Amino acid sequence: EGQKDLLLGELLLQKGWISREALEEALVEQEKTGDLLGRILVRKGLPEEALYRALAEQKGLEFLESTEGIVPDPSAALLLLRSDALRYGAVPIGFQNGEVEVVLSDPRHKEAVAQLLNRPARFYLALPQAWEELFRRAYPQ
Amino acid sequence: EGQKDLLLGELLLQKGWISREALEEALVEQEKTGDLLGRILVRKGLPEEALYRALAEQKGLEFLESTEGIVPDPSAALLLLRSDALRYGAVPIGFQNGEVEVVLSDPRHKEAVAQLLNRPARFYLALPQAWEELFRRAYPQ
Ligand SMILES: Nc1nc2c(ncn2[C@@H]2O[C@@H]3COP(=O)(O)O[C@H]4[C@@H](O)[C@H](n5cnc6c(=O)[nH]c(N)nc65)O[C@@H]4COP(=O)(O)O[C@H]3[C@H]2O)c(=O)[nH]1
Ligand SMILES: Nc1nc2c(ncn2[C@@H]2O[C@@H]3COP(=O)(O)O[C@H]4[C@@H](O)[C@H](n5cnc6c(=O)[nH]c(N)nc65)O[C@@H]4COP(=O)(O)O[C@H]3[C@H]2O)c(=O)[nH]1
């Protein structure tokens, strides 16, 4: 679990998705634009799925390649108001071994959601459009 | 599209997923061994998904991150015998606009499968694990 102590750029370098010169160029650009590093690398050719798998490794989330098969448990969605699910980007979908399963849209929100839910939870990560489709399934109307 | 005219090394270089030095070493080893180039590159640290994304662009295939969302259509599976689907590494999964949708395990087989099917087809490419999971669902023993 040593990947949780790595910077994003280092994780992608170790995997081989970017070169050291591309990373330095990206950090140089960031110093003047303020954009997130991952957004710059994606614009420069990194697949968004590769970006999210690295961010999932960094924060201890399970990346979901697909949300199409999930049937959200209504009892789990009760654990967050719809307005909170939207604002925190978090969808409770079910339960495993006394933990609530929660699908995040942004790995940076893991800590704020965990503190709020205040109970054992297992966190997943989904790309924006898969997250949005799951959210409407779980929190209709 | 003009991507179909490029060598694999050229495609990886233009996408920024391989260095010129790493490609040259792999091509020199291949002169000595005859191994498939992408096999040498992945062994030297190229992400397998980078290899498959490049090979998909080269053969005009859509790369599939996951097959877990696919519900294989039984009538499409009739278009190949199970033994053929396995030998050719091809799973017919459905139909769209009068084309059969077919998920391949190896882009080098696209031409052999297309001639056999002998009808309009749209081809996809999936990583080995995702392919095998789809095949087992489409063609139970
Ligand atoms: N939803 C989303 N989240 C993203 C994205 N990119 C990064 N995140 C995460 O947001 C945190 C802050 O990203 P940053 O603003 O680019 O701020 C970065 C960045 O300025 C820099 N950095 C990242 N990687 C490297 C590296 O390899 N070497 C060096 N010298 N600095 C790095 O260190 C700071 C902290 O990096 P991290 O620990 O990895 O923490 C990162 C990462 O967890 C994105 O595109 N989308
Ligand atoms: N499923 C799968 N398919 C793979 C893999 N590696 C290559 N393929 C594909 O198989 C064809 C033959 O690969 P090769 O024997 O290594 O034979 C290659 C290789 O010897 C060489 N080559 C590839 N890229 C370059 C390059 O950038 N520069 C130079 N000078 N030669 C290259 O030219 C030949 C033609 O390569 P391509 O037109 O790209 O056609 C390649 C590519 O379509 C793999 O690991 N898995």
Numbering used by the authors:
A (entry chain B), B (entry chain A): 161 to 301
Article, verbatim:
The traffic ATPase PilF from Thermus thermophilus is important for type IV pilus biogenesis, twitching motility, surface attachment, and natural DNA-uptake and contains three consecutive homologous GPSII domains. The N-terminal part of PilF harbors a remarkable arrangement of three successive general secretory pathway II (GSPII) domains (GSPII-A to GSPII-C) with high sequence similarity to each other. Interestingly, we find that PilF binds only two molecules of c-di-GMP with different affinities and that the c-di-GMP–binding activities can be attributed to the GSPII-B and GSPII-C domains. Remarkably, the GSPII-B domain binds c-di-GMP with a KD of only 6 nM and thus with an affinity ∼ 83fold higher than MshEN.
To further test if in general a hydrophobic interaction is indeed beneficial to high affinity c-di-GMP binding or if this effect is lysine specific, we created the K167L PilF159-302 variant and characterized its c-di-GMP–binding affinity. Remarkably, the ITC measurement with PilF159-302 K167L yielded an even lower KD value of 2 ± 0.3 nM than WT-PilF159-302 showing that the large hydrophobic side chain L167 might improve c-di-GMP binding of PilF159-302 even further. Thus, we crystallized the PilF159-302 K167L variant, which yielded crystals diffracting to 1.9 Å with the protein chain being traceable from residue 161 to 301 with no Ramachandran plot outliers. The L167 leucine side chain is well resolved and in a similar conformation in both chains of the asymmetric unit and involved in an extensive hydrophobic stacking interaction with the c-di-GMP guanine base. Moreover, a large hydrophobic residue at the very first position of the c-di-GMP–binding motif is apparently thermodynamically and dynamically beneficial for very high affinity c-di-GMP binding.
